[PDB]
Every structure is written in C-alpha cells, then in structure tokens.
C-alpha cells in the first residue's frame, strides 16, 4: 500500500507485508515470538509494518546508544502515539517535545536519594501490613495469587509516597482504589480495538472528537475527583513530596495536568511492581537453592528478622542479582520506541523522517549471542565477576538514556522491600496449580496467561 516499499527501498530485509494489515497477523504468535524470530531470520537489523507504519528493529548495541542516548533530544525524543489519550496527551511518558522536557525536569526530583529515603519507613508500615496478610493465607496451607496479595501492597506504597495519603488497602479486600486502576488497559490484539488503531491511525483523530478513551470514562472520574480531593487536603492544611512538587508548579502546571501525571505514576507503581514480584516469585520457587541462598543474604545482613533500611537494602548483592536476573527473562516493556522526526544517518544507516525505529529488548535478553543457555534464570550472570561481560544496551529493562524509566530507583527498592520482609517470614513452594514451566500472555502486556499460584510456608 505505498509505504510498503520502504525497506524493499532500503535494501532492509524483513517479512512481506499485507495489503493494509502489513505484518500484522504475525502478533498472532504474540509479539515477543515475533521479534525473536525475526532475529534469528534476518540479523542484526530488520524492517517491518504495524499497518501502514514502517517500523525499523535495531540490534547493534552501537546504534542503540546512538538513538536512545546520542540523539535523543535532536531526533529520537518521542515514543509512538499509540491511540486515543483525550487529556492523558499531558502525561510525561506520551509528552512530546518541549512539553516533555519541562515535565522530565519538574518531575524528576521526586525520586532522588534523599526523597527515596524518607519513603523507607513509610513504606516500613505496609512491609508490616503485607507479611500480616501472608501469615493469615500461610496457616491454612491453602494455595495463593500473588498478583491479588502483591497488588494492594502496591498500591498502598504508591498511593502513600506520592501524595501522603495512606489508604489502608492491605486492611481492604474490598477496596475501591485497586479495581477502579487495574481496568485501565484492555490491551490485546483478541481485543478488537487496539488492533485497530495499532494498525489503523487515521481513527485516532476521529475517537478524540468522539472523547472515546483506552481508559474508560469511568476510572478517569474515580481517578479525577479522587486525586481532586487529595489536592485541596494538602492545600487546605498549614512532606515535600510528589503530589507537593507539583503544587509547587500550581503557583507552569495546571490541574488536568497533575491529574495526569499522578494517573501515569498510580499505574505504573502498582501494576509493573506486582508483576515482577510475582515474576521474581515463580523463579525463587521453581529454583529453592536460589531461594535459600538469598534468605540466607537477608539473615546475614539483616540479624534477627531486622527490618530492612535503605543502605542495607543496597548491601545485599545477590538480592539485586535476583531482580537482575527476572528482569532478564521477563522485561516488561517488550520493545523500546523512538519515532525518528527527521532523516538522519547512524553508523552508516540513513534513516528516513517518520520511522519508529525498534529496540526488542525481549529478544535481546534471549539472544544466544550475549547469554549463554539464554532461557534459564542464572542469577549468577550478574555477579561482580561477570557483570561487566554484560552490555548496558542490550541489557536494557529500564531503557535508557533522558526518555529512560524515571521511576526505576523507587521500583527496585519497592521490590526489594517486599521482597525482604516476604522472605524473612516465608518459604514459597510449588503446588498443583502451579503452571510449569509458566508461559507468557500473547496479548499486549508480558503477563503470566494463568496467574501465579504457590504455597506459602511460615519460618
Ligand atoms: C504495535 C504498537 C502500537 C505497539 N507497541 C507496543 C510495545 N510498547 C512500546 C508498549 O508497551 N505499548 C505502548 C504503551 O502502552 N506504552 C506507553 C504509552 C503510555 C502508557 C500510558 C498509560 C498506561 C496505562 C494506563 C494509563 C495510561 N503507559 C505508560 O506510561 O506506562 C507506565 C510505566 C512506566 N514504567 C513502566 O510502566 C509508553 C511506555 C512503553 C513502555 C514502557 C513504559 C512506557 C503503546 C505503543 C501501545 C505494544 S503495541
Ligand atoms: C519494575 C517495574 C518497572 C519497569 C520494568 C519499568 C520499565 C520502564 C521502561 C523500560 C520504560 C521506557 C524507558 C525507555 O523507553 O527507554 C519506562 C518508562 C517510564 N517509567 Fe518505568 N518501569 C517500572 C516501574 C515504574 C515506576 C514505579 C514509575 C514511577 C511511578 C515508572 C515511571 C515511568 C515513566 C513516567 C516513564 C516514561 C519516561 C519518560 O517518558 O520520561 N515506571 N518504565
């Protein structure tokens, strides 16, 4: 359809593409499959078409750093436009431009060491609550769903940190601020929607005259008014925080504005957080000497069940090798995007004003070039004594460069955290509901398609 010679153009190789659906129908397979196999099809460097849009997948770590960290204010500054946003345009990981740079720079102060430390003993209240909620599924020997139990502790520490609104959902089974949040991406490609404005752009402008939203009108209200609330309770009293920095702003940002950053930052901090938890879960049970080294770290540099702080925290090696280690095999973004605005050449490639260009991380974590036997989990990979064998642009969970993860220092420590007190109480084994091996979620996000389900014993 036009578009569709570009790469034929190039002398890039990649799969043939479809009158309109381009590629398309090759995310049946889901689309980490996909890019593993175009990997191993067509080297280091391929094309293919999300529609009509022309998307070049990159591979040389070179080249990586070049867009993601060389050229990033100059041509690489925005992620693709996914679909219809309506005031959700304002929000720092759909920002473009100028608009982003300002929110970058004004909301990166949150998540410095100093700001990270002073969320150490708050979250040291809901560590508490958490293993409490164990301890009670833990007697009756009966089988659990870390995503449920994971989950509200996320959501305790986001909601807590950020605005200084403790509300209680670790004590709240029944809890409308976890349910409202969760139903915020219908994403997959059964979902007959997103597969229409993956493929299909022209729509997008259309559904943002029609208000139509991937956020149905009924969180954004629940969201809306709520974070509305806690607004006029911090401006009506007499902790410099996240919610406060931007009332520092209030006196160049704007309401909807704030909204949408809090929105952006109540989703990632509660679902990625409980994701990777339960990720991290699966690979301490499905491996017990990996489970048993790490609580033995935990004792040793935590004595007596001691709560963690924050260096601490940072002492413990082989804790942050685990993580490492999940992240490898299951980094949730699957892919990183930059849309290239305008013609460039890097490392003796042009490429052309308007191409997304393609980082596949999932495939990169998996390649048999820089890992050896790349599907099973090996912490050891990470240690000290090979972890400088690793390249910091093909291990890459976090993205990188200025459009990387602003919230990555507070995930790793929000991980840790409930990772420590969960293992300075439990042991976690293997049931009958348990999916062996576990497989992915074709669909949009890299999800567990059964949810987790282990045992959990007391100490
Ligand atoms: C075919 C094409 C359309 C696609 N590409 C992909 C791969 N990909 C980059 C995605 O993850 N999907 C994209 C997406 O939703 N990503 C977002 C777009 C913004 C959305 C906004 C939003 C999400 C949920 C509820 C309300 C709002 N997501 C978002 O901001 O994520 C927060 C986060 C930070 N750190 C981890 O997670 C950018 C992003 C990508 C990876 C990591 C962090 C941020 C879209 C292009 C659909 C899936 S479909
Ligand atoms: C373990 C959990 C998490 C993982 C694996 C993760 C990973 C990422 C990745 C890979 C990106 C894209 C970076 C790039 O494209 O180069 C990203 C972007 C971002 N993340 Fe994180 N993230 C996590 C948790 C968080 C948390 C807790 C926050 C803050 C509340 C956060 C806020 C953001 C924002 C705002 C962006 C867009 C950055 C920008 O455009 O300036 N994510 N996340």
Request: proline share 7%; glycine share 6%.
């Amino acid at each position: 359809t036009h578009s569709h010679g570009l790469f034929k153009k190039l002398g890039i190789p990649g799969p043939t593409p479809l009158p309109f659906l381009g590629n398309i129908l090759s995310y049946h397979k889901g689309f980490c499959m996909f890019d593993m196999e175009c990997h191993k099809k067509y080297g280091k460097v391929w094309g293919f078409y999300d529609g009509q849009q022309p998307v070049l997948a990159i591979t040389d770590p070179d080249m990586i750093k070049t867009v993601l960290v060389k050229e990033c204010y100059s041509v690489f500054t925005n992620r693709r436009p996914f679909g219809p946003v309506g005031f959700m345009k304002s929000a720092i990981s759909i920002a473009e431009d100028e608009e982003w740079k300002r929110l970058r720079s004004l909301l990166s102060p949150t998540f410095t060491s100093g700001k990270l430390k002073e969320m150490v003993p708050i979250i040291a209240q809901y560590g508490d609550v958490l293993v409490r909620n164990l301890r009670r599924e833990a007697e009756t020997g009966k089988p659990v769903t870390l995503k449920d139990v994971f989950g509200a502790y996320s959501m305790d520490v986001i909601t807590s940190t950020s605005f200084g609104v403790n509300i209680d959902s670790l004590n709240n089974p029944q809890d409308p601020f976890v349910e409202n949040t969760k139903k915020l991406l219908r994403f997959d490609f059964l979902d007959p929607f997103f597969l229409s404005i993956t493929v299909f752009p022209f729509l997008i402008p259309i559904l943002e005259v029609l208000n139509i939203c991937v956020f149905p009108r009924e969180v954004t209200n629940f969201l809306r008014k709520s974070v509305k609330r806690m607004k006029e309770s911090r401006l009506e009293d007499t902790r410099v925080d996240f919610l406060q920095l931007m009332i520092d702003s209030q006196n160049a940002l704007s309401d909807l504005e704030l909204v949408a950053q809090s929105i952006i930052f109540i989703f990632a901090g509660y679902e990625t957080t409980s994701s990777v938890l339960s990720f991290i879960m699966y690979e301490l049970a499905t491996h017990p000497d990996v489970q048993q080294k790490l609580q033995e770290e935990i004792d040793a540099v935590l004595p007596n069940k001691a709560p963690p702080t924050y260096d601490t925290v940072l002492q413990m090696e082989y804790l942050d090798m685990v993580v490492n280690e999940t992240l490898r095999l299951f980094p949730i973004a699957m892919r990183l995007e930059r849309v290239c605005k305008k013609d460039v050449e890097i490392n003796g490639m042009f490429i052309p004003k308007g191409v997304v260009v393609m980082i596949p991380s999932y495939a990169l974590h998996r390649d048999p070039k820089y890992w050896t036997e790349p599907e099973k989990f090996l912490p050891e990979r990470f240690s000290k004594k090979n972890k400088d064998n690793i390249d910091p642009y093909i291990y890459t969970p976090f993205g990188s460069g200025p459009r990387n993860c602003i919230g990555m220092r507070f995930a790793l420590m929000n991980m840790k955290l409930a990772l420590i007190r969960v293992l300075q109480n439990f042991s976690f084994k293997p049931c009958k509901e348990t999916q062996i091996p576990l497989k992915l979620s074709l669909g949009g996000l890299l999800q567990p398609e059964k949810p987790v389900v282990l045992k959990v014993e007391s100490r």
